[PDB]
Amino acid sequence: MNFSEQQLINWSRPVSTTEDLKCQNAITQITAALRAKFGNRVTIFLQGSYRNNTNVRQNSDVDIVMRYDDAFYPDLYNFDELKADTEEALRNVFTTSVERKNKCIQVNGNSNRITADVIPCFVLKRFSTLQSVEAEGIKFYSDDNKEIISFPEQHYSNGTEKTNQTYRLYKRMVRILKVVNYRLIDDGEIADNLVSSFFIECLVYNVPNNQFISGNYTQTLRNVIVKIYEDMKNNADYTEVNRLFWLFSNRSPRTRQDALGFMQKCWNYLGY
Predict the structure, then answer these.
(1) Rounded distance, CA 248 to CA 120, Å?
(2) Does an H or E element contain 85, and which?
(3) 169-186 and 152-165 helices cross at what angle (nearest 10)?
(4) CA distances from 56 to 70, 104, 175 (A)
(5) After which residues is the chain broken (C to N over 2.5 A)?
(6) HSE of 252, CA atoms in CB hemisphere, 13 A
(7) SS3 call for 121
(8) Of 28, 98, 23, 89, whose CA–CA distance to 62 is shortest?
(9) What does the alpha-carbon distance between residue 14 and residue 28 come to, in Å, rounded to a whole number?
(10) 8 A C-beta contact, residue 132 and residue 95
């Protein structure tokens, strides 16, 4: 094929991480701005690629979640107000670097800190029929009125467990496929929203552990692509990484066809 084993290994490494000084600086500065307004009435934590350690680009933006949760985690109000107050707290400190977005408040970075997407949200509890239990996550509303729900803790823990069981290859394969995604987007071969990091992470998560071959990146990646591709042709019932909800649920607009087409473009780009 087109790329060597060593090239795949290189592509499998995390690039931006929470050890980076500019990431630490962003979290420190934004946390202080938020605490000045909200005190202990919020929990601050990370989600997305810095949390799951799946960044494949330099100086990537970090997703900082600000969960307003005084009612559930008290000290031992509608969403529109929360988001406006969050924007105000950030603008008081970062002034012109602050931009309101559909699903977050963006704080643009600078020479000494990465850009951050600050995600105000509330506690969310929902029953999972998959596990027949109530699950806790977060919820927020987009400016175009969508209810966005996330289970970042369960996503984090399940993905970490899987990579620990697959010779660390689960997340390494996610990272390789994210690299290929960005290359295909840059080349104009696929739309920039055909897949997402979350979608890729869920697809690879459903590949059985016995497909990940210790010390063989080329064959593992072949196994991953072939398995997802065949599963999509076969109408497979994939779960999200959180194992609480279905990947191809009627709440989600992404389809098995999106995954099938992406796998095909990856196969062709890699030259298997």
Answers:
(1) 26
(2) helix 79-94
(3) 110
(4) 36, 22, 6
(5) 76
(6) 19
(7) strand
(8) 23
(9) 22
(10) no
